[PDB]
Design a protein around this motif. Structure first.
Motif, PDB file in Angstrom:
ATOM      1  N   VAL A  89       0.824  -1.200   0.000  1.00  0.00           N
ATOM      2  CA  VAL A  89       0.000   0.000   0.000  1.00  0.00           C
ATOM      3  C   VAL A  89       0.867   1.264   0.000  1.00  0.00           C
TER       4      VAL A  89
ATOM      5  N   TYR B  59      -2.883   8.488   5.774  1.00  0.00           N
ATOM      6  CA  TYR B  59      -3.532   7.342   5.162  1.00  0.00           C
ATOM      7  C   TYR B  59      -3.226   6.104   5.998  1.00  0.00           C
TER       8      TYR B  59
ATOM      9  N   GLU C 127      -3.574   2.047   6.240  1.00  0.00           N
ATOM     10  CA  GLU C 127      -3.799   0.747   5.624  1.00  0.00           C
ATOM     11  C   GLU C 127      -4.784  -0.046   6.486  1.00  0.00           C
ATOM     12  N   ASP C 128      -4.401  -0.266   7.750  1.00  0.00           N
ATOM     13  CA  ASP C 128      -5.225  -0.962   8.726  1.00  0.00           C
ATOM     14  C   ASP C 128      -4.930  -0.383  10.105  1.00  0.00           C
ATOM     15  N   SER C 129      -5.912  -0.453  11.009  1.00  0.00           N
ATOM     16  CA  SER C 129      -5.713   0.023  12.367  1.00  0.00           C
ATOM     17  C   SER C 129      -6.833  -0.446  13.279  1.00  0.00           C
TER      18      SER C 129
ATOM     19  N   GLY D 106      -8.946  -3.107   6.317  1.00  0.00           N
ATOM     20  CA  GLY D 106      -8.280  -2.971   5.028  1.00  0.00           C
ATOM     21  C   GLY D 106      -9.112  -3.488   3.853  1.00  0.00           C
ATOM     22  N   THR D 107      -9.041  -2.758   2.726  1.00  0.00           N
ATOM     23  CA  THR D 107      -9.769  -3.092   1.505  1.00  0.00           C
ATOM     24  C   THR D 107      -8.958  -4.101   0.680  1.00  0.00           C
TER      25      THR D 107
ATOM     26  N   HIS E 192     -13.735   2.998   7.953  1.00  0.00           N
ATOM     27  CA  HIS E 192     -13.147   2.318   6.808  1.00  0.00           C
ATOM     28  C   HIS E 192     -12.925   3.323   5.678  1.00  0.00           C
TER      29      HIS E 192
ATOM     30  N   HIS F 166     -10.075   4.984   5.328  1.00  0.00           N
ATOM     31  CA  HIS F 166      -8.685   4.824   4.912  1.00  0.00           C
ATOM     32  C   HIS F 166      -7.912   6.139   4.986  1.00  0.00           C
TER      33      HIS F 166
ATOM     34  N   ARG G 193      -0.916   1.126  10.893  1.00  0.00           N
ATOM     35  CA  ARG G 193       0.105   1.445   9.903  1.00  0.00           C
ATOM     36  C   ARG G 193      -0.273   2.739   9.199  1.00  0.00           C
TER      37      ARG G 193
END
Length: 1011
Positions: free
Chosen positions: A660, A700, A702-704, A725-726, A731, A733, A766
């Motif tokens: 990403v 931005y 990614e995931d959290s 995460g997509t 969500h 992002h 991240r």
């Protein structure tokens, strides 16, 4: 030579040579125009007139004609010029002459067509209207091709191209309304009013609709080179009924269903015809038909027995030989219990080379299907030029006289047996030429402008599948187009023999009309990898709720289109052509993504166009470092400087590349104790702040999970961000956080604090592509709120200051009562542990020592808190020194003591550590070595719980026994008692016991006296 023979004659030519140029324009003077006297216009009219009775009145009728004669004269002066032009395309007079004769021609039809759509006579002028209208579209495409070649500016070209793309619609929709309302009023109940009905449908399907279907082929810019579309629709004959002097009452609908319903186009294989008898006369009673799917790409079809079989005589066999049956010579039979049957019917098989043997059922007849369905071409004998071939025949029977009148379907020869893909054309496959309908797809009836019925999906999945045969080109590459009409957003996957070769986001188009079916294409070509393949369409994006599909188009392509995208991509990064600045709302991430579009282009082809497009974006990206107030936003120097830049925790990682992330990014881990989080904080300095301006924090994720984000200045500003995460998950992002800089002092340097923080056992994050930037000037309300939150920060700063000014000078006072000099070196002999402890409460009351949000970040009154908390520790150290007793604080557990019962020890608030005797049978002795004959103190600090007393005795080998005791007296906070002790030996035992309950002891100290 009826208006139909000639209608076809055009359609033939229309289907084949569509290519622009002089070939098309003179080809229109060869067929209809510049050949039609007013006779053949009148005859065009008498065609429909006499189907519907209603005659046009002898003025409008009289002036429709005198117009047409006019248009036919003008079109000579236009085509002639054009011909001579093509031969010398650069003579000025000729090119000029051409602009004159286009304007004249364009304005000609613009005035005329009203006279052919006259109110209260719409329907009988359609076979004229269509010709006129159809002519208007030819000449409009001509400017679209030959305009700037002729002279006109490119503006008048597009304006004429508008009206082209317009009148293809308008001329169509009108041509359909009036066919419908024309066919609706010629219906009725009896035999007759199916015959006049079918004769309208048939004829005018040939003489108006089939031309209209091919109107789509006129969009110069969508169909630039050759194209060949197919007319998949069927039409209908019945020899018995059409050639009969009588009606059967209320019987029309019963004939209307013996017509098969919208279906996939099959290819008839064999007829098997059973004979029967009545009063000597044998006849055609019923039949048994078999049929094979398109391109023989699936098991042959099978219907039930039509009519009734018969044992009267043997059967008769009819099998596909050439290009199919093109002509029935049938012979009715009417016994006026009367009888009305076919009793003999010849079939003949088409070919362009040889003359194959005809099959006869019982005998040859005199009902030729060439004066109901006439041929295209009369340069050749009818084995070719046939136009139509027998599709599928049914059988009409009477209710429970005898009637057996077969109804023959005829299909056009543009609808070929096999699918095909040549290379110097654009081949259109209407999806009725499939071999296998995907589950949950139906074949709905046609709209009336696509020469055939269409597909419907009303929920996601597989449309249909077609067998493909790829001809002249071996390794040629093609794009694909899909003509669809949808009320919903879509995607359009396709496969080919196994592997997908497309996914596209196709837009919606509806809420039915010739402004329904849009046709977009692939953004990358493909090539077939075998002679005979299989193509399979699929509509996948969910919703239901209604999707129509007309045709799959196979258009070819050479190997620079995603270069025009990488052009405009880079340009919207800036504010203006000078490219000094970026848009406020173009972002460090967004910019990267544009930069990915640049390098994934072509080294091979657009090498130079790639270079500039990247030296821009590598510049635009350089601007988003310059505006960025975050110090060190690439996480390249963490915890290096204590003043400036990032400060995080060890449990942070800085990889540079990810699925990403295209530059450094930062992973944050969880934590076991919330009182100690993961963190990554920073102070934006006031040097970099502009008064009364909204600032923004962006990035931005990614995931959290459990990621706290703080923007601090006058208040705390706390947001949690849980991005997968997509329902309530962020969500998004992306993230953004506002803070508003009120005034701007430099003596205080309040600034703004950034803080990422994770507090949970199973949290993480991240992030990267971070920035902190000026946004806009505060104004209106925003400016009123911030100014309130200025004063109201300042009203606190001062109540902090006065409250704390007292407290330092109250605490400092209290601290030194323990020490005996300015130099913090010795204690005072009569200072105990409760005084030390009471002095830490005076220091720990300072308040705002540290940031509540994150104790890591030091706050105002840090340095002053820290020095008082020092001298508190300083004091503790000496208490240990002076104490002859070994570990009397119980700061090192119960060590150096001799423990008997079940005792334990625990810690308390502020550097306290407390032994606890929880039952009376428990003992805690310790020997201490003392000096024979000196002055010692013994000082104990403890409280008691429950009933009973707890007692701290002191003795030596012989009887120098003293004792201290603590009890509540009756029947948090430590009493302290002392005594003066002198031993004559050198050993003395300190022993802690209790009566009952619990006894809690902070310290047993023992001092020597030197005074």
């Amino acid at each position: 030579y009826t208006p139909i023979d000639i209608s076809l004659s055009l359609t033939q030519f229309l289907l084949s040579e569509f290519v622009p140029g002089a070939g098309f324009v003179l080809g229109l003077v060869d067929i209809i125009w510049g050949i039609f006297g007013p006779s053949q216009w009148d005859a065009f009219l008498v065609q429909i007139e006499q189907l519907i009775n209603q005659r046009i009145e002898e003025f409008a009728r009289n002036q429709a004609i005198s117009r047409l004669e006019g248009l036919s004269n003008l079109y000579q002066i236009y085509a002639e010029s054009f011909r001579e032009w093509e031969a010398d395309p650069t003579n000025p007079a000729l090119r000029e002459e051409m602009r004159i004769q286009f304007n004249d021609m364009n304005s000609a039809l613009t005035t005329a067509i009203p006279l052919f759509a006259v109110q209260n006579y719409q329907v009988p002028l359609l076979s004229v209207y269509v010709q006129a209208a159809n002519l208007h579209l030819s000449v409009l495409r001509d400017v679209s091709v030959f305009g700037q070649r002729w002279g006109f500016d490119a503006a008048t070209i597009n304006s004429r191209y508008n009206d082209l793309t317009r009148l293809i619609g308008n001329y169509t929709d009108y041509a359909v309304r009036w066919y419908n309302t024309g066919l609706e009023r010629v219906w009725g109940p009896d035999s007759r009013d199916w015959v006049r009905y079918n004769q309208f449908r048939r004829e005018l399907t040939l003489t108006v609709l089939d031309i209209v279907a091919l109107f789509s082929n006129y969009d110069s810019r969508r169909y630039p080179i050759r194209t060949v579309s197919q007319l998949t629709r069927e039409i209908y004959t019945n020899p018995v009924l059409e050639n009969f002097d009588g009606s059967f009452r209320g019987m029309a609908q019963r004939i209307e269903q013996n017509i098969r319903q919208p279906h996939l186009m099959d290819i008839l294989n064999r007829i098997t015809i059973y004979t029967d008898v009545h009063r000597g006369f044998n006849y055609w009673s019923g039949h048994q038909i078999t049929a094979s799917p398109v391109g023989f790409s699936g098991p042959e079809f099978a219907f039930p027995l039509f009519g009734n079989a018969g044992n009267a005589a043997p059967p008769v066999l009819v099998s596909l030989t050439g290009l199919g049956i093109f002509r029935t010579l049938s012979s009715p039979l009417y016994r006026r219990q009367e009888l009305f049957v076919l009793d003999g019917t010849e079939f003949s098989f088409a070919s362009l080379t040889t003359n194959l043997p005809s099959t006869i059922y019982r005998q040859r007849g005199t009902v030729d299907s060439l004066d109901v369905i006439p041929p295209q071409d009369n340069s050749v004998p009818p084995r070719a030029g046939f136009s139509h071939r027998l599709s599928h025949v049914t059988m009409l029977s009477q209710a429970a006289y005898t009637l057996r009148a077969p109804t023959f379907s005829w299909q056009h020869r543009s609808a070929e047996f096999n699918n095909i893909i040549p290379s110097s054309q654009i081949t259109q496959i209407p999806l009725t030429k499939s071999t296998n309908l995907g589950s949950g797809t139906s074949v709905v009836k046609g709209p009336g402008f696509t020469g055939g019925d269409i597909l419907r999906r009303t929920s996601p999945g597989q449309i249909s599948t077609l067998r493909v045969n790829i001809t002249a080109p071996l390794s040629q590459r093609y794009r694909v187009r899909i003509r669809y009409a949808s009320t919903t957003n879509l995607q359009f996957h396709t496969s080919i023999d196994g592997r997908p070769i497309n996914q596209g986001n196709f837009s919606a188009t509806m809420s039915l009309q010739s402004g329904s079916f849009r046709t977009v294409g692939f953004t990358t070509p493909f090539n077939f990898s075998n002679g005979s393949s299989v193509f399979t369409l699929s509509a996948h994006v969910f919703n239901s709720n209604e999707v129509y599909i007309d045709r799959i188009e196979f258009v070819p392509a050479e190997v620079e289109y995603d270069l025009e995208r990488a052009q405009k991509a880079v340009n919207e990064l800036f504010t203006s052509s000078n490219q000094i600045g970026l848009k406020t709302d173009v972002t460090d991430y967004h910019i990267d993504q544009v930069s990915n579009l640049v390098e994934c282009l072509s080294d091979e082809f657009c090498l130079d166009e790639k270079q500039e497009l990247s030296e821009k974006v590598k510049h635009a990206k350089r601007l988003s470092d310059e505006r960025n107030l975050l110090q060190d936003p690439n996480f390249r120097g963490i915890n290096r400087q204590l003043d400036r830049g990032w400060r995080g925790s060890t449990d942070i990682t800085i990889q540079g590349g990810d699925d990403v992330f295209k530059e450094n990014y930062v992973t944050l881990l969880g934590t076991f104790d919330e009182c100690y989080p993961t963190y990554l904080y920073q102070k934006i300095d006031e040097s970099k702040l502009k008064a009364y301006t909204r600032y923004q924090l962006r990035g931005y994720i990614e995931d959290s999970q459990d990621l706290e984000i703080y923007l601090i200045r006058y208040n705390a500003k706390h947001e949690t961000v849980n991005v997968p995460g997509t329902k309530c998950a962020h969500h998004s992002h992306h993230f953004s956080l506002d803070i508003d800089v009120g005034c701007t002092d430099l003596n205080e340097d309040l600034g703004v604090w950034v803080i990422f923080k994770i507090k949970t056992q199973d949290g993480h994050a991240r992030l990267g592509n971070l920035e902190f930037l000026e946004e806009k000037p505060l104004v209106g309300e925003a400016l009123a709120r911030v100014k309130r939150a200025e004063k109201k920060w300042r009203d606190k700063r001062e109540k902090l200051e006065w409250e704390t000014n007292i407290v330092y000078k109250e605490a400092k006072e209290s601290v030194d009562a323990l020490f005996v000099n300015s130099q913090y070196d010795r204690l005072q002999a009569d200072t105990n542990i409760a005084m030390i402890h009471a002095a830490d409460k005076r220091v720990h009351s300072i308040r705002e020592a540290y940031l509540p949000e994150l104790s890591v970040i030091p706050g105002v009154n840090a340095a002053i808190f820290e020095e008082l908390e020092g001298r508190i520790f300083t004091a503790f150290s000496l208490y240990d020194a002076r104490n002859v007793i070994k570990n009397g604080d119980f700061n090192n557990g119960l060590s150096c003591w001799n423990v008997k019962g079940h005792v334990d020890v625990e810690e308390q608030n502020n550097h306290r550590s407390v032994l606890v005797v929880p039952e009376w049978e428990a003992e805690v002795s310790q020997e201490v070595r003392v000096c024979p004959g000196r002055g010692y103190i013994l000082r104990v600090t403890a409280y008691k719980e429950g009933y009973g007393e707890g007692c701290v005795t002191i003795h030596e080998i012989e009887n120098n026994t003293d004792e201290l005791k603590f009890s509540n007296c009756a029947e948090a906070g430590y009493v302290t008692k002392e005594l003066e002790y002198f031993p004559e030996t050198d050993k003395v035992w300190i022993e802690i016991g209790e009566t009952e309950g619990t006894f809690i002891v902070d310290s047993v100290e023992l001092l020597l006296m030197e005074e």
